């Protein structure tokens, strides 16, 4: 499933037009990206959580930030 | 940021009403969950990819499926 297909699925099940579904899909992902940028954690009931972890400085290799996702029980169970 | 706050952010930036933004947010996450359930991979340009990995059977511990996320370059760079 790619982005175009996700937008089509969102449009079809929500009743929004494809133009509005597009706006909403972009806003979801842009919002999550902005929250992480600020160093906040995005906690979504049922789905999972997004957070940023810092990878430690070492061996003359600087520290860096890594976006990460932890699946929630609901997603873990649906996939099993 | 929790789900309610994500919905508010989506409503505010997309121009949709909070009721429609709710529908769209749920559809995004339900769609991604359904795609994984089917064993498909969700590839979203800029953000990242979701996929299911099988954890191997071993030591009289059965195999199991794990939902996973790989961040895309765009998200990696925005967060750094």
Swiss-Prot record, chains A, B:
Region (Disordered): 56-80
Keywords on record: DNA condensation, DNA-binding, Phosphoprotein
InterPro entries xrefs: Hist_DNA-bd, Histone-like_DNA-bd_CS, IHF-like_DNA-bd_dom_sf
GO molecular function: DNA binding; structural constituent of chromatin
A cellular component term, taken from the record's GO annotations: cytosol
Record note on quaternary structure: Homodimer.
Homology family: Belongs to the bacterial histone-like protein family.
Classification via PANTHER family: DNA-BINDING PROTEIN HU (PTHR33175), DNA-BINDING PROTEIN HU-BETA (PTHR33175:SF3)
The protein's name in its UniProt record: DNA-binding protein HU
Native source species: Geobacillus stearothermophilus
